[PDB]
Amino acid sequence: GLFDRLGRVVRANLNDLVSKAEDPEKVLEQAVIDMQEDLVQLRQAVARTIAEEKRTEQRLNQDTQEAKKWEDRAKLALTNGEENLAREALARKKSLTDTAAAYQTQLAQQ
């Protein structure tokens, strides 16, 4: 468009007008200062994601061993013939094995 073409002209003049305000001696050391503190910010954010990979691996180890407890209790109920209580324990187990599978998927991605 015509007003795109005028825009790109007037925008380019302004960008050149800034470029010759840059003193090579002052800006060249400021650029290294900026690039150093960028790494300080980045390292904080990375570490904050490492803390959570460490933390989902704990949760996975609970819910795998908690589901064993409810499997053992279901067998105990059936040897006592209390089949209505065995169903209840199996319902507790299923919800744990489904959420443990989410932690495996999350953790490999992290």
Binding site: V27, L42, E52, S95
Partner: protein
């Protein structure tokens, strides 16, 4: 005494789904912390690339 059987089953069906809800809550609160940490990281990498000190 035909009503108290109905209520007594409905009372047990409730606590069964509280237990499920409470296990899922833990997994969701974990995912919401991970996703928020990654959002701050990806925002940091964008601002660094926008300053482009290495091009100057």
């Amino acid at each position: 005494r035909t009503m108290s059987e109905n209520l007594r089953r409905n009372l047990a069906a409730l606590e069964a789904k509280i237990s499920e809800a409470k296990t899922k809550k833990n997994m969701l609160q974990a995912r919401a912390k991970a996703a928020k940490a990654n959002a701050e990281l990806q925002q940091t990498l964008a601002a660094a690339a926008a300053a482009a000190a290495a091009a100057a």
